[PDB]
Design a protein around this ligand. Sequence first.
Ligand SMILES: COC1=C(OC)C(=O)C(C/C=C(\C)CC/C=C(\C)CC/C=C(/C)CC/C=C(/C)CC/C=C(\C)CC/C=C(\C)CC/C=C(\C)CC/C=C(\C)CC/C=C(\C)CCC=C(C)C)=C(C)C1=O
Ligand code: SF4
Lengths: 115, 57, 155, 318, 175, 98, 83, 70
Amino acid sequence: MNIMLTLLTNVTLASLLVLIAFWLPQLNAYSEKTSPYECGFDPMGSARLPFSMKFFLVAITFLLFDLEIALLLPLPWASQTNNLKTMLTMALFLLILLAASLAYEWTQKGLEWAE
Amino acid sequence: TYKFVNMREPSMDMKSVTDRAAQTLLWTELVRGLGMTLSYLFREPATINYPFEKGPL
Amino acid sequence: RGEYVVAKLDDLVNWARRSSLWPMTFGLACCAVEMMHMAAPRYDMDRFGVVFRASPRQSDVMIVAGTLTNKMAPALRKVYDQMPEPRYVVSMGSCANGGGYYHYSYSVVRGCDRIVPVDIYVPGCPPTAEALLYGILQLQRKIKREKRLRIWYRR
Amino acid sequence: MFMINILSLIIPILLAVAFLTLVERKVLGYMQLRKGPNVVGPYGLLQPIADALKLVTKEPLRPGTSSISMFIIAPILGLSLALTMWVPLPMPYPLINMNLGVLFMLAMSSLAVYSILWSGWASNSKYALIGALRAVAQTISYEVTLAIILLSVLLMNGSYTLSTLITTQEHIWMIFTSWPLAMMWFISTLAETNRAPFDLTEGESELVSGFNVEYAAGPFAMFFMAEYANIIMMNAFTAILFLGASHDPHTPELYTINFVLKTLALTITFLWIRASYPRFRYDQLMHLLWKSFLPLTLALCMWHISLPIMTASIPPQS
Amino acid sequence: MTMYIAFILSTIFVIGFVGFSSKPSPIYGGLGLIVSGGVGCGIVLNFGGSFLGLMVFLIYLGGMLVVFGYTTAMATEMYPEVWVSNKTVFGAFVSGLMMEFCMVYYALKEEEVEIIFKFNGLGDWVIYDTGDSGFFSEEAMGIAALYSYGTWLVIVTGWSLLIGVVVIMEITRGN
Amino acid sequence: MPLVYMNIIMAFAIALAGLLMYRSHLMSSLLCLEGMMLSLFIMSTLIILNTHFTLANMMPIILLVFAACEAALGLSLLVMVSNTYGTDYVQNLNLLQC
Amino acid sequence: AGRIASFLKNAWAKEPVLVASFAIGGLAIILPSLSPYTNYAIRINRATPYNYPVPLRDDGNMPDVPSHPQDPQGPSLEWLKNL
Amino acid sequence: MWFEILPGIAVMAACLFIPGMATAHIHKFTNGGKEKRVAHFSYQWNLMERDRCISGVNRYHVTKGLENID
Ligand SMILES: COC1=C(OC)C(=O)C(C/C=C(\C)CC/C=C(\C)CC/C=C(/C)CC/C=C(/C)CC/C=C(\C)CC/C=C(\C)CC/C=C(\C)CC/C=C(\C)CC/C=C(\C)CCC=C(C)C)=C(C)C1=O
Ligand code: SF4
C-alpha cells in the first residue's frame, strides 16, 4: 500500500506537469522549428548510423564487475556468523579475484580507450 | 633576455616525494583552488546598479 | 469581470517573460566582446534575471553581435527558426543594424533585418556594454506592453 | 494521514530545488564577484518563479525526427525517480521505513540514467547521441565505486536500514572512521549527479547540450528539476551517512534542524566546487575511477571487512 | 482491486515479456525487458524476498543498460524499427498479447487449467505459511551463509567470473 | 500451484519461443536469451522462499552470477559479427554453408 | 635492500595510489590472524541468542546444566561486560 | 554582499525543514503521540498484531496497562 501510493503520486505529478507543459503553452510551429539542431548549418545526415565508441571493453567489464558487487553485497549479514575465519577468508578471496581481474585487465591494454 | 618558464625538476628525496604523494591523495592544490573561491565570495562585488548607477565616462 | 481577469493573467505571463530572457549568443565580431563585458561583473547581466544559455531550443532572445556575412546568413535564419517562439531579436552595433562600416562590401548583407525580423535596435560601433544593458531593458519594457490575452479576449 | 504526508514531502522538495536555482546564481555570482539575481523580488527571492512560469508558457515542440513516446516518457522517468528516491531518507523518522533503504536508493539512482539517453536517443540528434553515450559509461563506471563505498561504510552499520545510521554515529561522526572512503564518495556523488568537475553530460563547452538536447519549456524544466533534486539529496544522503547528528526521541525538530543544516552546507560545497575547477575530459574521468579510485576502493573494502573482526566490533544485525 | 497483486504484477511481467520477445528494435526491447524486470522485482518483494527483489533490480538495470548501450553503439539500424513498424514485429507483438490474454481468460474462468502441468485459480495468497521469523529475515540469512556454508560456490563463481574477464578481452582483442 | 506459477512458466515458454524465432537481430535475440533468465530467477526465488529453503536462497544469486557472464559473452560475440559485417541481422553469416 | 628501497621509493613517486592500495590491501589480510580479538568476535556472535535455548529434559545426572536461568552453573558471559 | 546570499538559503532551509517536521508530527498524531512502531522483523510485527487484537478498538497504538487484567 504505502509504497505503491508513493509511486503512483510521483508519476501522476510528473505526468500532470507534462500535460500542462504541452497544452498550456499554445503552439505556432512549422517544419523549420522542428528541424534537428546542429549548431546552425545543415546536418550531413547522422544520429542513427553506427556511432562506434571505444570503451566497449570497459563497458562490458563493468557488467562483470557489477556482478562482483552483487556477490559481495550480503557482507553486512555475513559478519553475523559463528565461523568468521572462513567468512573472512572467502570475503577477501572474492575481493582478491576482483582485484586480480582488474589488474590483469589493466596490464593487457584493457582500460586504455581504443584510438 | 629570455626566461625558461617550465624547467623545474622536482627533488627525489624522501621528503619531496611524500609531499607530492600527499598532494596527490589528499587533494591540496584542489583545496587551494577551493580555498580561494571562498575568498572571493566574502569580497565586495563590483556590480553597478544600472540604471541608478551609470558607468564612468 | 472577464476583462480584469484576463488583464491580470496577461500581466503575470508578461512579467514571467520579461523577467527571464535567455540570450542565445551569436557572437560574430567585436560587438560580441562588449556584450561579454555586460556579462562581466561590472554590469552583471545575470542580476536582471537575464542569463546566457546555449541550445536555442532553450533560449528566448537572439543578440546579433557583429557583422552578418553572406556565407553564414543561412545559419542565422536556421538558428532563428529553431527558437521556441515567444522570441525577440536584438541587433548590436552598426554592422548588425544596417551594415555599418561594411555596408558597401560584396559579402556583407546590409543589415540583419533582411534575414530576420528585428526588435529593438542597439546603435554603436561597438555599443558600450552599458548601452546594451539599456537595450535589453527596452525589450523588457516592450514585453511589459504586450496585450496577448486582451487581444484574445477581444477577438 | 498519508496523502498529507506525501504532499508534505513533494511540495517542500519541489520548492527546495525551486530556490536552489536562486542560491546557485546568487552563490555562483558572488564567487565570481558578480551579485546574482537581485532584481526579481527582494534579493532575487522571486527569480525562479519567474523562470519557472516562463518555462511552462513558452512554446514546447517535439523534434521533427523525435520518437514522441520515448521523448515524453524520459522527463517522467527523471522526475518520478528523483521524488521517489527521497522516500526512505530518515529525517528523524523516515517516511517509509524500508528494511533495505540503502539498496533501494542505489537501485533507483542507477535508474535515473535511463532518462538521460532515452531522451538522447529519441531526440535523433548528433549532439544528443554523443551526450547520451558519454553519460551512460560515465555513470556506471562511477557506479562501481558508488556500490563498494556504500558497502564498506555500512559494514559498521550491521544492516542496510537508513534509520540505523542515527544509532551508528550516535557518539562519533562516521567520517572520522571512514574519511578515506568519504572523499571518493563525495567525488562519485559529484559524478552521478553530473555537477561540474564532470558535467560532461551537459558538456556545454563541447556538446552545447546533452542533459536536454532539443527539450523545451516543460521537458527541459523536468530534466533540470530532476537533477537539482538529486543535488540536494546526494548531499542529504552524504549528510545522513557520514555526518550524523544528535537525535532526541522526544524532540525530533532539533535533528531536522541539524540535518537540514548539513545538507545546506554540503549543497553549497557542490556549488562551491562547481566554480573552482575545469572540466574533466572523458578519458580522464574514466581513468580517474577505473585506475585510481577503484584500486583504493577495493583495498579500503578489504580493510573494512577485516576491521570489525580484528577489533571484535561486529555491529548488531538488528 | 488489492485482492492479490501477484497475478496483476505477473501479468504486466508477461506483457512486458511479450514485448521484447517479439523482436522489436533492440532499444525498445530494453524497455520491454525493464518493465518486466522492474515488476518482477515487485513480485519477489511481495513474496517476502525483499533483498532478492531489489537484487535483480540493481544487477539487471546495469546489465540491460550496457545491452542497449551496445545496440546504439554498433547494432543500431539507420532507420530503427518500432512496436508498429514492420508487420512482422506487429504480427509477432499482437500475437503475444492475444495469446497471454487468452490463457488468463482460460485461467480465471474455471480455475482448473490443465495445460502441461496443473494450474488451479484459487489465490497465490493461500500458499503462504503461518509462522514467525524471529529477529532475522529468512532470505537475508540464507544468502549470508554463502561465505560460511557455500565456500565451494564462492570458489567456482569467483574463478569463473575472473575467467569471464579473460575470455571477454581475449575474444574482443583479435589480431 | 497457483496462477503466478502459470504466469512465469508460460512466460518462459514465450522466451523460448522468442529466442527460437530469430527474425532480423542478434541483439534482439540476446534480449530473449536474458529474458529466459528472468522467469528462471523469479520462479526459483518463489520456490525456495515459499518452501523456506533458506540455505538454497543463494541459488537465485548464483544464477545471476552466471547470468550476466553469458550476457557479456553474447555481446562480445555480437561486437565482432557487427564490427566486421556491419550489422547484427542473423543472415549475413552464411559463409559457413560450405 | 637497495633493490627493494629503490623500487618502493620509485613507486611512491609515480603511482602513489597503487602503492597505497596495495598497503591497506596487504594489512587487511595479515593482521586479522595476528590480532587476539578475533576469538572474541566469534564468542560474541556465538553468545547471541537468536533462537530459543530450548530446555532439555532433566533425567538427573546433568550437573552442569542449570535448572533455573539465575543458577550459577552454565555459560556465563561476564567477560562481555568487562570487555 | 555575502549576507544577501542568506535569504536564498533561508527559504530553502525552511522548505527542507517541513518534511522532517511533517513526517515526525504526522506519525505522532496518527499513533496517539507515541512514535510509529517499526517492524523490521516478523517478531516486531507479531507484537503489533497482538496489540491490535488486544486493544479491542482494533488500534495497535491504543495500549492497555495493568488495568486490563485483574
Ligand atoms: C554544464 O552543467 C550544467 C548544469 O549543472 C551541472 C546546470 O545545472 C545547468 C542549469 C543552468 C543554470 C542553473 C543557469 C540558470 C538557469 C536556470 C535557473 C533555469 C531555471 C529552470 C527552472 C526549471 C526553474 C525552476 C524554478 C522554480 C521556481 C520551480 C518551481 C516549481 C513549481 C512551480 C512546481 C512545484 C510543484 C507543484 C506545484 C506540485 C503540485 C502537486 C499537487 C497539487 C498534487 C499532485 C498529486 C496528486 C493530486 C496525487 C493524487 C492523485 C491521484 C491519486 C490521481 C489518481 C488517478 C487515477 C486515474 C487513478 C546547465 C544548463 C548546465 O549546462
Ligand atoms: S558595428 Fe563596429 S564594433 Fe560592431 S561588429 Fe561592426 S565594426 Fe565591429
